[PDB]
A paper describes a structure:
IL-23 is a heterodimeric cytokine comprised of p19 and p40 subunits and plays a key role in establishing autoimmune diseases such as psoriasis, arthritis, inflammatory bowel disease, and colitis. IL-23R interacted strongly to wild-type and most of ala-mutants, except for clones with alanine mutation at residues 137, 141, and 145 of p19. These residues, in particular W137, have previously shown to be major sites for receptor binding.
Sequence analysis of specific p19 binders indicated that more than 40% of clones share a common motif comprised of phenylalanine-Glycine-Leucine/Threonine (FGL/T). Binding of two FGL containing peptides on-phage, 23–644 and 23–652 to IL-23 was confirmed in a titer dependent phage ELISA. A crystal structure of IL-23 in complex with 23–652 was determined and confirmed the HDX result. In particular Trp26 (p19) was flipped out relative to the apo structures to pick up an interaction with Phe7 of 23–652. HDX and co-crystal structure results confirmed the earlier finding that W26 is in fact a hotspot residue for binding of peptides 23–644 and 23–652, since neither one of the peptides retained binding to the W26A mutant of IL-23. As expected FGLT-containing peptide, 23–652 was confirmed as non-blocker.
Residue numbers in the entry:
A (entry chain B): 0 to 14, 19 to 29, 38 to 69, 77 to 98, 103 to 158, 164 to 260, 263 to 280, 283 to 305
B (entry chain C): 4 to 18
C (entry chain A): 8 to 34, 46 to 117, 136 to 168
């Protein structure tokens, strides 16, 4: 069957027998002047990408949603098992970021929609997907925000992220389900200072909570991991709820954060040499 | 599955 | 008001116990959740904490009944050295201060859910201790 994606844009689903598509004028294909048919409507047998494109009476785009061995196409995005979308949150605000990867440089379009829940979905506002990085492989990223977020609640319906991927005449879609709490990765501890103690090897390590983290800290607490590590790979770790610790310095100190009450993702390390 | 110390609060108390 | 720090100490212990019972990271709601309007947020706590605590109590009683049920007291039997045993006791302890096998998949669901519930409750009591 066929369906509307946007005005004058259609997705033809196919598995060579081909799918018969009736094109009603409000005929030529793409650049060519060669007339392919007469009549207000046009019957096309869509079997291949050649039988797709913008069909114009004397105006109508057709994209394909191909299916090989009974499984929709996932070529546009590369697997980061079957994980094409990776999402993170710096806090409980209802604000999150999703990233995906591709090998394609041009004629690429991404549409991103999100919601909390599937039945009577609650509004989430997403921005535009924009190229954010290149590596020796292109990285795109989007920022979404839950419309009426409730940072302190125990979520029971997941956020749903839906990404439409269109590479020329190939249409594909991607999905991701999660609770904010499961995609939490705090920013690193900030203002990581070191205070040498007179005639001793021990230093007073001090840092602050990251600026982006949920407030109040007395409610949304973090656990910090203070680490002393030398050049070559012992493990010298201490865990604390305090924003300072005292350690033995030889001749490096790192600090990382995680949510105190739920085992979410560890933050990136903040570091200072001894 | 992870190590119990993966949860920093667990590690703080039982590690 | 309740023993804020004792609740703080206990609720934190529930977090680590719920972790050890299910130390798994990753990704039809027949459990009570601390929803947005149950008043367990920092503002709701100052304004009227009794409301929040009556929700924490409901949820605690609920999970006690789940942990003491056939889901956990059935084949495949729990090990004696189980955190789930400790966890059941702790839920009862905090509630008192306030006043392919199918069964395997159900334990995972309940313990994962329990982890989310106890994290909010732990935050409630930590804030309560620090500000009340
Ligand atoms: C993702 O792709 C699928 C498959 O093309 C879409 O499913 C079709 O959607 C239309 C409009 O909602 C329905 O009339 C068809 O019945 C669906 N086809 C099938 C095979 O069920 C789905 O809508 C797409 N998702 C998004 C977010 O657009």
């Amino acid at each position: 069957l066929i369906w509307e994606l946007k005005k004058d844009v259609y997705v033809v689903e196919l598995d060579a027998p081909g799918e018969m598509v009736v094109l009603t004028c409000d005929w030529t294909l793409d650049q060519s002047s060669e007339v392919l048919g007469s009549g207000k409507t046009l019957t096309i047998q869509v079997k291949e990408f050649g039988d797709a494109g913008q069909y114009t009476c004397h105006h109508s785009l057709l994209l394909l949603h191909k299916k090989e061995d009974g499984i929709w196409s996932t070529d546009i995005l590369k697997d980061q098992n079957k994980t094409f979308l990776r999402c993170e949150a710096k806090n409980y605000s209802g604000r999150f970021t999703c990233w995906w990867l591709t090998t394609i440089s041009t004629d690429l379009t991404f549409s991103v929609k999100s919601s909390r829940g599937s039945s009577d979905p609650q509004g989430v506002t997403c921005g535009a997907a924009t190229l954010s990085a290149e590596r020796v492989e292109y990285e795109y990223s989007v920022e979404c925000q839950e419309d009426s977020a409730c940072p302190a609640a125990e979520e029971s319906l997941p956020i749903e992220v839906m990404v439409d991927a269109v590479h020329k005449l190939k249409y594909e879609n991607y999905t991701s389900s999660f609770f904010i709490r499961d995609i939490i990765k705090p920013d690193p501890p900030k203002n990581l200072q070191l205070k040498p103690l007179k005639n001793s090897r021990q230093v007073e390590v001090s840092w602050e909570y990251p600026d982006t983290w949920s407030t109040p800290h007395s409610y949304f607490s973090l656990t910090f991991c203070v680490q002393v590590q030398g050049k070559s790979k012992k493990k010298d770790r201490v865990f604390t709820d305090k924003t300072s610790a005292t350690v033995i310095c030889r001749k490096s100190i790192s600090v990382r954060a995680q949510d105190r009450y739920y085992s979410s993702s560890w933050s990136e390390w903040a570091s200072v040499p001894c | 599955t992870k190590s119990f110390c993966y949860f920093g609060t667990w590690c703080q108390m039982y590690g | 008001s309740p023993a804020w720090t004792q609740c703080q100490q206990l609720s934190q212990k529930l977090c680590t116990l719920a972790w050890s019972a299910h130390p798994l990271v990753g990704h039809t709601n027949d459990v009570p959740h601390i929803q947005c309007g149950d008043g367990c947020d920092p503002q709701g706590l100052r304004d009227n904490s009794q409301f929040c605590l009556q929700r924490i109590h409901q949820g605690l009683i609920f999970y006690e009944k789940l942990l003491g049920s056939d889901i956990f007291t059935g084949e495949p039997s729990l090990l004696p050295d189980s955190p789930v045993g400790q966890l059941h006791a702790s839920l009862l302890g905090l509630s008192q201060l306030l006043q392919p096998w199918q069964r395997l998949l159900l334990r995972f669901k309940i313990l994962r859910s329990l982890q989310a519930f106890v994290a909010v409750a732990a935050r409630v009591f930590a804030h309560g201790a620090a500000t009340l």
